[PDB]
Design an enzyme around this catalytic site. Sequence first.
Site, mmCIF file in Angstrom:
data_model
loop_
_atom_site.group_PDB
_atom_site.id
_atom_site.type_symbol
_atom_site.label_atom_id
_atom_site.label_comp_id
_atom_site.label_asym_id
_atom_site.label_seq_id
_atom_site.Cartn_x
_atom_site.Cartn_y
_atom_site.Cartn_z
ATOM 1 N N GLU A 24 -3.969 7.712 -4.741
ATOM 2 C CA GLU A 24 -4.276 7.194 -6.072
ATOM 3 C C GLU A 24 -5.605 7.792 -6.553
ATOM 4 O O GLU A 24 -6.488 8.004 -5.733
ATOM 5 C CB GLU A 24 -4.353 5.662 -6.047
ATOM 6 C CG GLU A 24 -3.019 4.987 -5.712
ATOM 7 C CD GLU A 24 -3.133 3.493 -5.465
ATOM 8 O OE1 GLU A 24 -2.244 2.933 -4.792
ATOM 9 O OE2 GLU A 24 -4.101 2.876 -5.936
ATOM 10 N N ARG A 27 0.833 -1.197 0.000
ATOM 11 C CA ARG A 27 0.000 0.000 0.000
ATOM 12 C C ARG A 27 0.871 1.251 0.000
ATOM 13 O O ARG A 27 1.923 1.286 0.637
ATOM 14 C CB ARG A 27 -0.928 0.017 1.225
ATOM 15 C CG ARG A 27 -2.084 -0.970 1.146
ATOM 16 C CD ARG A 27 -3.142 -0.511 0.143
ATOM 17 N NE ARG A 27 -4.295 -1.415 0.022
ATOM 18 C CZ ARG A 27 -4.399 -2.450 -0.821
ATOM 19 N NH1 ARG A 27 -3.409 -2.799 -1.641
ATOM 20 N NH2 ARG A 27 -5.514 -3.146 -0.841
ATOM 21 N N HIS A 76 -1.375 0.595 -10.041
ATOM 22 C CA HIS A 76 -1.935 -0.408 -9.154
ATOM 23 C C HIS A 76 -2.424 -1.643 -9.911
ATOM 24 O O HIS A 76 -3.592 -2.005 -9.840
ATOM 25 C CB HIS A 76 -3.029 0.240 -8.284
ATOM 26 C CG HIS A 76 -3.278 -0.469 -6.993
ATOM 27 N ND1 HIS A 76 -3.808 0.156 -5.883
ATOM 28 C CD2 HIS A 76 -3.100 -1.761 -6.640
ATOM 29 C CE1 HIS A 76 -3.954 -0.725 -4.909
ATOM 30 N NE2 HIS A 76 -3.519 -1.895 -5.342
HETATM 31 N N1 LIG Z 1 -0.550 -3.887 -5.381
HETATM 32 C C1 LIG Z 1 -1.615 -4.695 -5.347
HETATM 33 O O1 LIG Z 1 -2.444 -4.720 -6.238
HETATM 34 C C2 LIG Z 1 -1.777 -5.617 -4.165
HETATM 35 C C3 LIG Z 1 -2.308 -6.892 -4.354
HETATM 36 C C4 LIG Z 1 -2.461 -7.748 -3.261
HETATM 37 C C5 LIG Z 1 -2.080 -7.311 -1.995
HETATM 38 N N2 LIG Z 1 -1.573 -6.082 -1.817
HETATM 39 C C6 LIG Z 1 -1.201 -5.661 -0.450
HETATM 40 O O2 LIG Z 1 -0.285 -6.594 0.119
HETATM 41 C C7 LIG Z 1 -0.654 -6.854 1.472
HETATM 42 C C8 LIG Z 1 -0.193 -8.226 1.941
HETATM 43 O O3 LIG Z 1 -0.976 -9.290 1.398
HETATM 44 P P1 LIG Z 1 -0.747 -10.800 1.917
HETATM 45 O O4 LIG Z 1 -1.783 -11.703 1.379
HETATM 46 O O5 LIG Z 1 0.675 -11.164 1.763
HETATM 47 O O6 LIG Z 1 -1.005 -10.646 3.476
HETATM 48 P P2 LIG Z 1 -0.544 -11.533 4.712
HETATM 49 O O7 LIG Z 1 -0.433 -12.954 4.239
HETATM 50 O O8 LIG Z 1 -1.426 -11.146 5.875
HETATM 51 O O9 LIG Z 1 0.941 -10.993 5.010
HETATM 52 C C9 LIG Z 1 1.206 -9.761 5.664
HETATM 53 C C10 LIG Z 1 2.653 -9.766 6.137
HETATM 54 O O10 LIG Z 1 2.984 -8.483 6.660
HETATM 55 C C11 LIG Z 1 3.506 -8.609 7.993
HETATM 56 N N3 LIG Z 1 3.225 -7.376 8.777
HETATM 57 C C12 LIG Z 1 2.009 -6.807 9.023
HETATM 58 N N4 LIG Z 1 2.089 -5.706 9.731
HETATM 59 C C13 LIG Z 1 3.459 -5.540 9.953
HETATM 60 C C14 LIG Z 1 4.208 -4.565 10.648
HETATM 61 N N5 LIG Z 1 3.616 -3.514 11.268
HETATM 62 N N6 LIG Z 1 5.556 -4.680 10.682
HETATM 63 C C15 LIG Z 1 6.142 -5.722 10.070
HETATM 64 N N7 LIG Z 1 5.518 -6.699 9.389
HETATM 65 C C16 LIG Z 1 4.163 -6.566 9.355
HETATM 66 C C17 LIG Z 1 2.925 -9.903 8.519
HETATM 67 O O11 LIG Z 1 3.749 -10.474 9.531
HETATM 68 P P3 LIG Z 1 3.556 -10.168 11.104
HETATM 69 O O12 LIG Z 1 2.068 -10.246 11.450
HETATM 70 O O13 LIG Z 1 4.354 -11.233 11.890
HETATM 71 O O14 LIG Z 1 4.089 -8.758 11.391
HETATM 72 C C18 LIG Z 1 2.898 -10.758 7.266
HETATM 73 O O15 LIG Z 1 4.165 -11.405 7.055
HETATM 74 C C19 LIG Z 1 -2.153 -6.638 1.493
HETATM 75 O O16 LIG Z 1 -2.609 -6.346 2.821
HETATM 76 C C20 LIG Z 1 -2.418 -5.532 0.474
HETATM 77 O O17 LIG Z 1 -2.465 -4.243 1.092
HETATM 78 C C21 LIG Z 1 -1.422 -5.240 -2.861
#
Ligand SMILES: NC(=O)c1ccc[n+]([C@@H]2O[C@H](COP(=O)([O-])OP(=O)(O)OC[C@H]3O[C@@H](n4cnc5c(N)ncnc54)[C@H](OP(=O)(O)O)[C@@H]3O)[C@@H](O)[C@H]2O)c1
Lengths: 319, 318
Positions: free
Chosen positions: B257, B228, B275
């Site tokens: 955005e 994000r 995006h």
């Molecule tokens: N550009 C795009 O079109 C697009 C597409 C898909 C997703 N995304 C973004 O990518 C994100 C992740 O997706 P995902 O499926 O991988 O989610 P996920 O499986 O929940 O993974 C999130 C990761 O971030 C870590 N995290 C969360 N808060 C943190 C913090 N404050 N400090 C350090 N690490 C932190 C978590 O570990 P810990 O809980 O141990 O900290 C976990 O490893 C989404 O939430 C979305 O905003 C963007």
Amino acid sequence: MSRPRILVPGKINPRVLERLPEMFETVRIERADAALVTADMRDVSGIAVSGKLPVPLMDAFPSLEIVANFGVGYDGVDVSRAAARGIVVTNTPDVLTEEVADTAIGLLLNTLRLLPQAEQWLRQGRWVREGAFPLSPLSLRGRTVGLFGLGRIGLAIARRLEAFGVSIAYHTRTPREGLGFTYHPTLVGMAEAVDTLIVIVPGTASTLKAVNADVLSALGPKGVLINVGRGSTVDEAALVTALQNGTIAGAGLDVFENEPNVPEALLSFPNVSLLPHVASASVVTRNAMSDLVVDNLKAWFSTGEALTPVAETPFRRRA
Amino acid sequence: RPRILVPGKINPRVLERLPEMFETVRIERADAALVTADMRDVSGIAVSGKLPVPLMDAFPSLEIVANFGVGYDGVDVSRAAARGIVVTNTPDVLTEEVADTAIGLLLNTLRLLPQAEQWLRQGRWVREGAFPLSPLSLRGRTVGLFGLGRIGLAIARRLEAFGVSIAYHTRTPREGLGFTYHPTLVGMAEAVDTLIVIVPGTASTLKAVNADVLSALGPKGVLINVGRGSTVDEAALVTALQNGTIAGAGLDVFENEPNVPEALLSFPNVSLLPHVASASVVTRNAMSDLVVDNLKAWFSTGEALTPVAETPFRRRAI
Ligand SMILES: NC(=O)c1ccc[n+]([C@@H]2O[C@H](COP(=O)([O-])OP(=O)(O)OC[C@H]3O[C@@H](n4cnc5c(N)ncnc54)[C@H](OP(=O)(O)O)[C@@H]3O)[C@@H](O)[C@H]2O)c1
Ligand SMILES: NC(=O)c1ccc[n+]([C@@H]2O[C@H](COP(=O)([O-])OP(=O)(O)OC[C@H]3O[C@@H](n4cnc5c(N)ncnc54)[C@H](OP(=O)(O)O)[C@@H]3O)[C@@H](O)[C@H]2O)c1
Ligand code: NA
Ligand code: NA
């Protein structure tokens, strides 16, 4: 005995020029053209060259011992004629393998997901006025990739593709044992079986227009062609027809039949990515290629054994 | 037949499939002022992007918000949980797609492939010869993943095959994996030359990629953001790029955005995408299906398919 004279025709990476003085006298001509050779240049012992080495230029030097080719591909050198004169030819394998494999994946992803076009949409202000870039009709997800060629670079590409969760097959003249990829004894047979064809063979008589109308038809209507080998391997006219008719779904090309000329018809398509032969074109990788050119010449003149002679010229120096 | 509100734009596949079980109510913007008296019986919402609290709170009978996307920061999940409203997202069905885009963007940033293509298309290969060599390469790089979840791990798996060193920073380490854990983001940034952002856009990650992190990343530093835009201090990134504090950046996401500041557009060492990380037909179709299948599962069985961690709820009817 002391300093051999090395000809460099046309453009070459300055790192080559910088390092030649370690052992050699350098002779430059502005183009790879025999008409530019003077009487004073008749003692030249070696050539360092990127791209084409015309036979009349090569044959202007009675004392020529070695052609050090800048690049792993050396189809611009007439190796048959070199061998017939007892002239060793060297190339630059290995030091560019990973770089080229990186470009191949980049080009594949750009072709399938239209990332360059998406960037243009943003940069031209279209995200603001017209909203989201259109969804890409294609994706890597669920694809079956066939590698035409599985050598140094082809295998490095396959290794990357394994981590993308796609099925992998390959076509070479001889299968490679010990690897878990599906071998196809014919190119057209592989094309039938896959929806994504990556070309990474040398530009020889045997691969000349191997990717033809039949192979493209067999590849099919979800078909994507990626060429990072040599442009001669693809029937460029047949590719344009196939793209026009929807026989295949897209293409990504780093190489072309008559570089730097790309036909206007190829430039028109919205489902095509085009690059100006950049697969090894980083500073670090071109520096390594330059070093290997010079180190080949140094090894030849100091020990009589080149570092990376080509298969056609397994020669040792006689002086 | 439960009534589902869809505010603003959504993939037509969602709209195509909702009639399998539901009545659809459309409004052109996510705005409470467009809600009429007749819409007060709405039971569910399907939404892409922002769901303002006054819009969510215009519906006394609201049971479920089905968010289009794995990220759901546009939904006020705290307020949803306080009302007993289940929130669902779209994990897993986009993981590989997003990981693919992350690598593509990384390669484009390092090797300047889009710019090389422009050089060719503008006729410069013919008139001026070879595109300039890219100062950067993936070769010899050390990649630090900020986030190592579903998508972060899928990115790491790809990177393993490119022959680069891999490290990561999360709040809690992931055991069993052979990657170097860093307990601080700035510490990881010091150790690496390539930072990939793939965390959710929460209060905890807000401007986590700041001046200090970018300075620590260093003068060969490349930042890739596919998470994000709120996670990056966009102003600090522009300064860092201007000063040469870092070497380059590739961004799929931004603070406001679809607005990208003019200064970010000026740089020759920056790749920008609108995006697009999940934006293929096949993957958006799968995301649409999961939004609808969540709503169908909720209303038919009382159990959602992919509720978010904050709302592990089961349906109570009436
Ligand atoms: N550009 C795009 O079109 C697009 C597409 C898909 C997703 N995304 C973004 O990518 C994100 C992740 O997706 P995902 O499926 O991988 O989610 P996920 O499986 O929940 O993974 C999130 C990761 O971030 C870590 N995290 C969360 N808060 C943190 C913090 N404050 N400090 C350090 N690490 C932190 C978590 O570990 P810990 O809980 O141990 O900290 C976990 O490893 C989404 O939430 C979305 O905003 C963007
Ligand atoms: N775009 C660029 O800038 C760039 C950069 C580097 C290299 N290249 C090109 O890539 C080529 C390959 O490089 P490399 O280092 O991978 O070479 P390599 O290690 O010699 O690999 C060549 C592969 O092609 C196969 N092959 C050759 N002729 C064939 C034929 N007629 N039918 C089927 N397979 C055939 C070989 O297998 P078999 O002999 O068993 O058939 C082998 O698997 C170079 O020659 C060069 O032209 C382009
Ligand atoms: Na096929
Ligand atoms: Na660093």
